Amino acid sequence: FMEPLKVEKFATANRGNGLRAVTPLRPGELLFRSDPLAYTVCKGSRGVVCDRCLLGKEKLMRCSQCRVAKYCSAKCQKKAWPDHKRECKCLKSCKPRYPPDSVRLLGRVVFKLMDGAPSESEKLYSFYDLESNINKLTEDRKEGLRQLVMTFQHFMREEIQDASQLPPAFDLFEAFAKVICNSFTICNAEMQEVGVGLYPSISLLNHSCDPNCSIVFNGPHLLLRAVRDIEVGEELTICYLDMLMTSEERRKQLRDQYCFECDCFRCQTQDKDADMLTGDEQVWKEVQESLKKIEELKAHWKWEQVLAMCQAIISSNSERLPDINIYQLKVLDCAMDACINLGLLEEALFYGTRTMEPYRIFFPGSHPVRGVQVMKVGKLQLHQGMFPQAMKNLRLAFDIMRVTHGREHSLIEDLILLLEECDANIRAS
């Protein structure tokens, strides 16, 4: 009921500020929970999940005024009103255009800065403390930031007309630099992207391709946990990137977006790069290309389109391109997720099983994305009466997620129940 702060801000040798433990930490230990300073649904999910709680409830009611924001209840619509009142007229005026996520997010940020009532999200680090990397920014990035600025000014014109209507310390250009640099993709239960937010305190964490911490979201609520034994004074790290990336791809996105090159052992040794790019470049690069179109359809929840593209690609390469190739792998993943959202459970189990061994290799021992994946496969097996396999995978998912999601998490509750149902049928038959 009164757990003490187990982490603290500190200055690193080279990585700027960071976060480190003040006490020894066990895997699964909760380090920090934070509400966002500000957050918003991402473009692809507007109208599919509740603007407030980010859950994908079946039937949503749109805000009468703007008909852009949608809510799962009067409760959520009311609770979100402080975050929505200053943007509503802006969204109405914008139609049929919709602003970029960063512009809508920042639009929420500026009013929260005036709050005056201390934000629990800024307990260790404020919005103004956030790194902007302005000195390191390329000219190409600065031009883009300038565009975001002008877009902001147009999008907000009904509510903000001059710099004097915002705090003086605030600077719009530097703000977008910070947003690009410090924002978090908010994922749901099934590890789907549903939103984006600023979590200034959490933003203290520096990057590693081999992190000692993981993050999982409870709606907009962010939970930070250790995923292995951490010593006193040891820097806490998370992974800014998708795990299914070559060391070259990671080096590029960390540079273009975060203005630094990673020096972790995985990046110094090109760890697992070979396996990732298994197969002939002439073959998998077509897949890599298609992946863009597919991921955009997935973001917009177009599962029928996603499935169509995937099984086309999948069947087309079955004779020459192995599942462990990360681009092929991603397609199998998308295919699986699509089948699940379309009730095609047997087909889902087919694609999902094929992701299992590659996921074990490419993901660390305890990673939330792997855990949830293993959970889905076990469930799909359970639904097909393949009890002993299901039992194996359900146990594994529990083993992982009790560390990544924590025991108190709702998915653990389902998991336990599934474990019982499954372990019964074993002794029974």
Binding site: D101, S102, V179, I180, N182, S183, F184, T185, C187, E193, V196, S203, I215, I238, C239, Y240, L241, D242, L244, M245, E249, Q253, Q257, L291, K292, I294, E295, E296, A299, K330
Partner: peptide, 9 residues
């Protein structure tokens, strides 16, 4: 896009 975490299209 942008944001710490999230898939890589």
């Amino acid at each position: 896009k942008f944001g710490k975490g999230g898939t890589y299209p």
